[PDB]
Amino acid sequence: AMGSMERASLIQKAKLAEQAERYEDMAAFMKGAVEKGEELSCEERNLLSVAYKNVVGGQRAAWRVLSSIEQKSNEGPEVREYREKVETELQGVCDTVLGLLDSHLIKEAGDAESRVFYLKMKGDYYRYLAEVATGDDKKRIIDSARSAYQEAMDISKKEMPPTNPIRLGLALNFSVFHYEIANSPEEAISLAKTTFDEAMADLHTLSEDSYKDSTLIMQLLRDNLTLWT
Template sequence: MSPVKVTLSRLDCLYLARLAEQAERYQDVVDQIKSLIVSSQGQLTADERSLLSIAFKNITSNLRNAWRAVDSLEKRDDNTKRQLVLMQLEKKRIKDELYGACKDVVDLMDNHLIPSASPGEEKVFYSKMKGDYYRYLAEFSKDEPGDQSAKLSLEAYKWAYKHALANLEPMHPTRLGLALNFAVYYHDIMDSPERACFLAKDAFDEAIAVISSHVPKTGQTIEDSLMILQLLRDDMILWSGEIQQGGFTDTNSSSQVTVLRYGTDR
């Protein structure tokens, strides 16, 4: 018997993507949303783009954590030369997978989602994602001669932040999430806690100034914004301590909390 061919509607694809997310099959989520991107000429709903963001975040987080775990084991004093060679091989495999996943995101942003996005929040959201995934690549390649990941991440963040300031309210979760991740870029990639603190404090202060009069728009909640404000505050405290001590106390941000609804993360 030949396999039954099923034509999937947009709602079918969205249901399968949600189902795959619940089953933690994140590549399946990506595949379903990619089919929607093709069929809709790059136009995604807020739910669809959130699913795409969540899926890629989980895929790349697993790879980043795996690389760090092997890197930590590599620094032990009791490794043999053979073990060190094998660890280097495994780190390269993980890095290659990470590069493939991040390149997949950037290609989707450049070729489909950013060109088709409406001005304002949607453009900012996708441009922030582009900056994020170039930043993830820069984490593991910033010391490699000729690597452009850090530069491309900075360009995407700058473009997104300029448009966020012009189009989004200070308490908008996408604007706050962008400020958070842009500040992390300055801290983790540029090794500048001073610039990270300046950007984070500016976003924090502007949001606090209007918090009493903020009325969430459709699809937003005040809880999302408050959670990101707490992350900004936590990082500012950590980075201020580093500045006072004249050096880094940690190469990562203060928290690995992820606000997945709006794709806000570290």
């Protein structure tokens, strides 16, 4: 689709699409940029992630509305058919993102910051697949999310300080995985509390701007702990 457009033009248009709140366009521009085959910078990785999180976030919100109506109706075929249509679309977007990570973003990512970022994405998009999966295939999808998050966690704990925002966001999302997907609320609570406490003890090392970045995500961990305890 985007093979004839320059990489730099795809990046520029992804930024314009974000300003215009055109997230499907944004995601298509960033897919085109990934498919140029070069590694992504920190800013470009963020554009890729923001684009797809907005696309799949709208699909997930729609799927939840439709799934609620469908469950109530089971307390014609149209509600199920339309929930299935939205579900298939959502699965297709998740498969597209997972395909970009597998061909070839992860394998070329050698610095800890890029590798953790992509493995967190891989965990997130398997988690969104798990949200709509039913049965034993749900089990293998759940394991794929778990494995991606665990590898990211292992690298992050070895290579990044406890206040690093990607390390923090990874721990936040892995704790949500434990609570919401893996039926492990105590593991969720433990991980959120340990992550929060270890970040708090490292705040003294940070500049004012880094302090703001880290404390914002720490508050999200606290917000989940408040809801869970």
